[PDB]
Every structure is written in C-alpha cells, then in structure tokens.
C-alpha cells in the first residue's frame, strides 16, 4: 500500500481487489472483485470474469510467488480458443488492490507472469508465477559447431528486409494448418527457407509464429510448405503471411546464402578431446595446416 494507510488503519475499509493482464498481443484484459465495472487507467476492469484471488505468497528467496486466480472464460473474456492457440503464454499481469470508492488509492501486490493456466469445466485456473520466473533457468552457449543465434538477434544482425529475401505473399490453400499451398510460390529458390518465421498478420491467427519445413514448389511456383507444429488457429485461405528466410546455422550455408559471415557467433573448428590428450608423434603429417 502507498499512502492509503489513513484509509487502511481504520477498521472501516473497502479495498476491493482488481487486476489487469497484458497479453503478448497489445490488448489488455480487465478483472475486478468489486462487482461493478471500474477503471483508473485505460483498462476498463470487468467483473464478468476472473477474480477469485487466492492467497498470494511471498519469499525473500529467489523462488517465485504464486496465485491461482480462479475465474471464468467467456466470449468477451479469454474465450479459450484464444488461449489454446498459443496466446496468453508470456502474459504479464499486475495485481492491484484498489479502493472502489476512490480508485486513486491503490498499489501493486506483485507484477506477475502467469505461468501455468489450467482450464476446465467451463472455467480457468491460472497460476501466477512471480517476478523471479526467469531466474531458475539455464542460459548459455556450449561451443557447438553450428551457429547459436536467431536471424533478428543482436549477435547476428541481418537487416532481414534488405532485398527480395522475405516472402510477403498472401495465403491460399491452408488445408490442415500444417500444409500451406500459397498462390504466389514463385520468386525464390527451391528450398530457400527451411527454418523461418511464418508470421501470419491477418485474420484468425493474428501475429502468430510458426516454423517452416519442407519448402517445395511442385508446379508453376506453388511452394507447398509444411510446418513443425500447428498454428493453433486455422488460417482462412485469405490471410497474409510473411516468411523470413531459413538459416541452417552452418558456415557454408551462412556465407553462401547470406552475406553475414562476419557476425557468425558460432564455433566451427573446436578440435576435440582426442586432440587434447594426444602427444605429438613425430610421424606423418606434422606441418602447419587446417587440421581439417
């Protein structure tokens, strides 16, 4: 609490809980216990869903906080066809504790990250992982002979729009949301993009990312492309996708297809264990060379 102590030290208090979650898409959602729709920021908290607010826990230790936050799913609300397709994953929340008589008397209990959401029986139950969720994970590179970065990354900047690299064409023939026909296949090499981002920016799957595989053009530039996984929302054979090119993350495929061999961030040579414990025999090749 932040200077509502004058309100709070009195036994007569009226603090009704309320929270907003910001999805990965730009829209937020509103939730409150107050039973009347209220807002203080431009969020318009709705008591139509959400809000059981069960027992936020704390700890000086790096372990996260948690709140299961039982609620309801509906057409205005999360609606669960949105949730199942892949949204609300890294959804960021702030829980508030507003005075409903005066919403300028509020604070934040925690800012969470909403890890595990269990929906069932016409309702949803969503564990609010704490601020320290990212700690507790392994991050590192292991000197492997491929590359290590994605295309947009700072360790390999590319300017991914710099030429006719991206395929901007609108989609037809979505079939089972893994096969995609694509009317405008023609314009690129066969098997040009094999590990790319199928960002779909229109229609049902709005701003949803999949990964391509099997970039094959069968006849007259069809370019039938598979994906690893379902998009989770069916594209409607009229959506617009853009596909960034595919990186095999290898030195040969780096420098040939792309110009950016300088920004490699990989470890091509990496001699081996048997080199390390080897003592130099004075036989055969012992002049300076590639060792490859």
């Amino acid at each position: 609490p932040e200077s509502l102590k004058a309100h709070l030290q009195g036994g007569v208090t009226t603090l009704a809980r309320a929270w907003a979650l910001a999805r990965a898409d730009g829209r937020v959602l509103g939730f409150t216990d107050h039973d009347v729709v209220l807002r203080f920021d431009g969020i318009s908290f709705e008591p139509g869903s959400g809000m059981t607010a069960k027992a936020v826990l704390q700890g000086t230790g790096l372990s996260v906080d948690n709140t299961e936050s039982y609620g309801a799913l509906s057409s205005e609300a999360i609606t669960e066809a949105d949730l199942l397709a892949g949204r609300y994953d890294g959804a960021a929340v702030t829980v508030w504790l507003v005075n409903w008589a005066d919403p300028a008397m509020r604070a934040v209990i925690f800012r969470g990250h909403l890890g595990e959401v269990s929906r069932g029986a016409g309702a949803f139950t969503a564990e609010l992982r704490g601020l320290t969720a990212a700690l507790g994970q392994e991050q590192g590179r292991i000197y492997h002979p491929r590359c290590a970065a994605v295309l947009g990354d700072g360790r390999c900047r590319f300017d991914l729009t710099k030429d006719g690299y991206a395929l901007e064409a609108a989609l037809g023939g979505v079939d089972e949301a893994v096969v995609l026909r694509l009317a405008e296949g023609a314009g690129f090499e066969d098997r040009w993009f094999e590990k790319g981002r199928l960002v779909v920016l229109d229609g049902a799957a709005a701003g949803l990312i999949g990964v391509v595989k099997n970039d094959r053009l069968q006849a007259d530039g069809s370019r039938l492309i598979e994906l690893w996984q379902r998009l989770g929302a069916n594209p409607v054979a009229g959506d617009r996708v853009r596909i960034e090119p595919g990186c095999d993350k290898r030195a040969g495929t780096c420098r040939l297809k792309f110009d950016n061999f300088l920004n490699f961030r990989g470890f091509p040579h990496i001699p081996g264990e048997d080199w390390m414990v080897s003592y130099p025999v004075q036989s055969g090749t012992n002049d300076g060379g590639s060792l490859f």
Binding site: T13, T14, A16
Partner: protein, 134 residues
C-alpha cells in the same frame, strides 16, 4: 437471461430471503478488528418458495424450471417484502433496480427440483432458492 414472467402467483408462508455480503474479516486477536467490503451491493438471495395448488398448476410449474429456465435465464422474481434509496439512517441505501418495481431478476439455486403429490390433486415442492445474478 430473460424478461419472461414474474412467477406462479402462489407462494407459501415462509418464503425467506435477505441480502448477502462477503465482507471478509480478520478479528485481530488482542483487540478490536478491521474488515473489508468488496461489494457496494447485495445479493438478495431469496429462498424457500413453495408451490401449492392443483395438479393443473404443476405442469406449468415443472416446465417453468425447464422451458424458460434451463439453468441460466432470468425469470424476474416477485418480492412480497430506476434507483431506490433507503433514508431511515443518515446513511443511504442507493441500491439500483435494473428491473422495474422490486422485480429482482434471479436464478434458481438447484440442480434438480422435487415436486411431491400430497393428495389426488395436491402438488407440493418444498424449496426453490435464488440469489439474483445480475
């Protein structure tokens, strides 16, 4: 949610019901207390309705639960007890009425009902609780 009808006219003597609050409470163990209210309103929470008429009234009452009921519809409720205020304190009630004139839209608090036969034409059912969902 409907606006269909009030109810069958008959209600037995004992149709109980009054407003609710959550108002969770800590009871500070070494002195007085402090307690919070998140409502600003009250669920009227009417209970213990009883239909008592002939069996001609029963078939329009069992399908009252069924036809316009299902589970999730209104059937505006008549109180034997547009904004109404209560001025008998210097505080105020100021409680809204979405429906006109004490009509308090509700829903039945039952997975099933239980109509009984008391005589050749007597139809009885002991309780139909409601909570007045908005």
């Amino acid at each position: 949610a409907f606006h269909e009808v009030r109810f069958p006219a008959n209600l037995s003597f004992g149709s109980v019901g009054g407003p609710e609050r959550r108002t969770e409470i800590v009871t500070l163990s070494s002195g007085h207390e402090e307690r919070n209210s998140p409502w600003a309103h009250s669920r009227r929470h009417y209970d213990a309705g009883v239909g008592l008429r002939s069996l001609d009234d029963v078939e329009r009452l069992i399908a009252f639960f069924e036809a316009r009921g299902g589970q999730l519809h209104g059937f505006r409720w008549k109180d034997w007890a547009g904004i109404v205020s209560f001025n008998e304190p210097p505080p105020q009630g100021a409680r809204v009425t979405a429906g006109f004139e004490f009509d308090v839209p509700v829903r039945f608090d039952t997975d099933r009902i239980a109509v009984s036969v008391q005589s050749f034409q007597a139809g009885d059912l002991p309780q139909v609780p409601v909570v007045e969902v908005r």
